[PDB]
Symmetry: D3
């Protein structure tokens, strides 16, 4: 059900400054994940994107959505297993149908909504939205391959 | 006004990265009250050190963000919303008292600052209040700050 | 309007700064048609601290971002030429991304070359598509639409 | 003296939140004298403040707390890196802090803490931060060592 | 012993890490004789924030450092080959630097290539000299004496 | 005696490449004593080295160069922020560098440079880096002062 930052750190190999999921609030094996990242001015990205106009990069929304899809794929296959997590990679192959509707700024709670669209063998296809305060700010479709870490 | 966004905070507070610790102001009554917040996320540089494998937003930075909330209240109460006057101001801590930390603050928390003015005279502002996550009190603090022209 | 632009020229046109300016040099530029630019990939980038420990891989989403910034440089110089005065009144906004493929991973020591062509443009709305290349091999592909908006 | 390498074996804090450089005096259950060098080459000065570098008062207090923590760790268990690696430090209270003089790059920030009261993992310390023999800050604080 | 080494191999031999690992790839290596390596220069390096604002110049002393790290890689591997287990126990300290000359500024977009050659070696003591080059032009030259020391 | 705020007005260097914190002594055309405080709370120590913080020797030499540049500039033009923005101190050569003692967090890294010779805009300086009386490094440096492009 609920996974906190300690739990996310044991499953995802991502680390600062590229770990872009703070908490998982809903997880349904093989179906869907609801997760989020808090947006704050005290992030390094905002030094350059943009000076005097802080806007969370669209591509990092898509990345945070990828990280949520990967956590869902992994936990669907093995559950919360830190030991197996160390031996796996989720390689993202394609990104499709992404639209940005509302900018994301410091003070926003950026909620990733992702569902499994297609799972066939090692290939996972996941899609959904990013939301701030019940409003769709971004949508994206993503495809990933599960493999062994080397 | 009563709601201020990061663009407005940037125009009033002299603090910048990595020491600007208020993201949004939800309410303020001039000379009286401020409610504001900072989002807590793993994607902050402090967490590299505090602590490895166990991210805990430092208590001293909760106090700092509370102080910055008081200083936004202080400036706008003195001169209103005036970025041109603001640009040459700084803020100094004078005192800190009666602080208690109750609950650890972690990534994914929305850290809400509630400050009330206890006493103010000219540039010297004494504020007290709480920091809250999900309606619970995580920290209490009393502090005195001075607004000063940069020289 | 010249065809080669260096970092000091890019600074004057793009509003992006560290750690989000991901184009180092422009090597080729045809107004309203095409741009070739590149970013040098080095271990000495903060991003590699997290992506990943002991295994530095330049993030795919940042390759796309680099392609966008290349497109936004093309878009702006096409409409205003090299004009830093007017460049300061603008910001680039991502509208859509589609058809992105990640074929080969990008690592420290790579010269990440961005090849973009204008697919459609009207006013501030620019639609570009192309590839990211390392040593003449297609490392990634993407199409994106952007808008140059008044900074307000 | 305990040097940075020894401090790293006892305190769990790391960059950019390790704010003690060297321990010059240690007396078990009594006092500690330690310092941190202040240099322009620290990331905090980018924001505090632009064009006027002033070491944050709250980080003076943090440094004092970390000094207190080192005194707490060692009075409890001595110099034992193995036990230390299990623990972290939690701030419980801060009280009676007064800042008198701004701390700036080029300053040697000296921490003087004595123990006021202690019980189990709970340590109450108080004292001053000093630059060149002058008191720049006073503080009292209570900390807890936790698994 | 190979002649080509990538970032995974450099990380296993050198103890340097961010922001002080200043070699990205080794293109040529001859034991006890020479190394050719490079570092990519990108705007996306923190060093450029302060050297200098609006005028990114790669610090000359960091060109020297990258040359030294290349030399230390050559030194270690000349003696033990590619031995990560032993590298973890050794550290190369530079004792002297001489005849440093800076000829051309190094900027974002540049491929900073280190050409080091062994002038003298007895045991743990190594004297190296050479150049940093960009586009086959010499941007810096230096001589250095290093020491293979214990890490503990 | 110059403080960081004075230093910031003369040197174009900013974070993380301004490596002088205070000027304690300055004789025009003659010498400078200056220092940089060394602390664990510096970004360089993340990689130089993990579990063993050692201030890079090339950065010691950089701090010496910055001190030597400050000496040359103020010798000619004094404390002049306006003229400073129109001038560049460009280092051409470095020679006779020796590293004797490692510099660590907690050290006050003191730079002692004298003018060896000068002719026009070409200035040669040299001296030591010292920690608590001991010589930790020596170096000679030649700089050219030029107009900001
Ligand atoms: O997005 C991910 C990327 C990777 C990854 C790790 C190493 C690579 O060389 C390439 C990709 O591993 C993962 C492992 C996971 O369990 C989950 C992920 O989302 C990822
Ligand atoms: O420090 C500087 C050094 C150089 C430089 C100039 C000539 C060289 O052979 C090597 C380096 O150019 C510069 C140009 C500037 O506009 C500013 C500088 O500080 C520098
Ligand atoms: Cl964007
Ligand atoms: Cl704390
Ligand atoms: Cl990726
Ligand atoms: Cl303060
Ligand atoms: Cl330089
Ligand atoms: Cl060194």
């Amino acid at each position: 059900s609920q996974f906190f930052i300690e739990h996310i750190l044991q499953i995802l190999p991502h680390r600062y400054p590229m770990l872009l999921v703070d908490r998982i609030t809903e997880l349904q094996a093989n179906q869907k994940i609801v997760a989020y990242k808090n947006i704050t001015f005290n992030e390094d990205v905002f030094n350059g994107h943009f000076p005097n106009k802080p806007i969370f990069p669209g591509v990092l929304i898509v990345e945070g959505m990828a990280q949520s899809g990967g956590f869902l794929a992994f936990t669907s296959l093995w559950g919360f297993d830190p030991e197996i997590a160390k031996t796996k990679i989720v390689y993202f192959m394609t990104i499709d149908k992404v639209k940005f509707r509302i900018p994301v700024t410091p003070g926003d709670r950026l909620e990733y909504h992702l569902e499994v669209l297609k799972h066939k063998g090692m290939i996972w296809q996941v899609g959904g939205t990013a939301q701030v305060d019940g409003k769709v700010v971004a949508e994206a479709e993503l495809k990933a391959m599960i493999a062994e870490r080397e």
